[PDB]
């Protein structure tokens, strides 16, 4: 329902400081929105940088820091590097669903694995079960989220599953379309999509998380094409 707005693009130079912001259409961003910041490199390489406003994901360089500034959330890069040229997304929580910002292309002048099939091709009307095989961590200690991205459109949160208890939570838009399950013996999360139409053509990502700590590691996505 809400709309999350980021700068279209920004340009910085190595060694400089750059600030990206994340705005909520409903009012000020508070810590109750649990903003996460995720970085997209080419070849569908998403990595989480900050979770829950200000916590840095372990292993992320110290030059990344998250905070609140005025009514907005902010990602500050102090001493930017050429490798920081990428697209930066923020996510906000609204009581029961995540909403993605539109992303900021940052131009710079000058172990845990989530394995997804690269693509799928099915005729309309079919059902499919996408997979996400994990390694490098103990599977049932983390939730698994699913996110999709339609061509020319933004990231949209589908839902999550907790492998231990089994509990799921879905975005209203996807309740009739998607069902999340796990197979713990093989460290695999599944998402079943039913009665596919051409509007279901998109890249579908699995992304790791746990309570208060979401979107740190990502699969590379399954590009699903529905066509007759």
Plain-language structure description:
This protein is an all-beta fold and 228 residues long. It has two domains: 1-113, no CATH class; 114-218, no CATH class. Helix content is 0%, strand content 54%. It has no helices and 22 strands. Strands 2, 4, 5, 6, 9, 10 and 11 form a seven-stranded mixed beta sheet that branches. Strands 13, 15, 16, 17, 20, 21 and 22 form a seven-stranded mixed beta sheet that branches. Strands 1-3-8-7 form a four-stranded antiparallel beta sheet, with no helix packed on it. The chain is globular.
How many domains is the backbone divided into? Answer: 2
The helix/strand class is: mainly beta
Strand content: over 45%
- Helical residue percent? under 10%
Main beta sheet strand tally, sense and closure: 7 strands, mixed
Distance between the termini: 32 Å
Question: What shape does the CA trace take?
Answer: globular
C-alpha Rg, in Å? 17 Å
Helical stretch tally: 0
Say how many strands there are: 22
Order of helices and strands: EEEEEEEEEEEEEEEEEEEEEE
PDB class: immune system
Keywords: antigen binding, affinity maturation, somatic hypermutation, immune system
Assembly: monomeric
Entry title: Single-chain Fv antibody of C6
């Amino acid at each position: 329902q809400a709309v999350v707005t980021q700068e279209s693009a920004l340009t910085t130079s190595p060694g400089e400081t750059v600030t990206l912001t994340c705005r909520s259409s409903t009012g000020a961003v508070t810590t109750s929105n649990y903003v996460n910041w995720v970085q997209e490199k080419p070849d569908h390489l998403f990595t989480g940088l900050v979770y829950s406003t200000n916590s840095r994901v372990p292993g992320v360089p110290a030059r990344f820091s998250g905070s609140l500034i005025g009514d907005k959330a902010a990602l500050t890069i102090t001493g930017a590097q050429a490798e920081d040229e990428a697209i930066y997304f923020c996510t906000l929580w609204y009581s029961n669903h995540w909403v993605f910002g539109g992303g900021t292309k940052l131009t710079v002048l000058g172990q845990v694995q989530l394995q997804q099939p690269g693509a799928e091709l099915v005729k309309p009307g079919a059902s499919v079960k996408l997979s996400c095989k994990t390694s490098g961590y103990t599977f049932p200690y983390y939730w698994m989220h699913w996110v999709n991205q339609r061509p020319g459109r933004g990231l949209e949160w589908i839902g999550r599953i907790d492998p231990n208890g089994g509990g799921t939570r879905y975005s209203e838009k996807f309740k009739s379309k998607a069902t999340l399950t796990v197979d713990k013996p093989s460290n695999t999360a599944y998402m079943q999509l039913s009665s596919l139409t051409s509007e279901d053509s998109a890249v579908y990502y699995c992304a790791r998380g746990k309570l208060g700590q979401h979107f740190d590691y990502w699969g590379q996505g399954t590009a699903l094409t529905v066509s007759s």
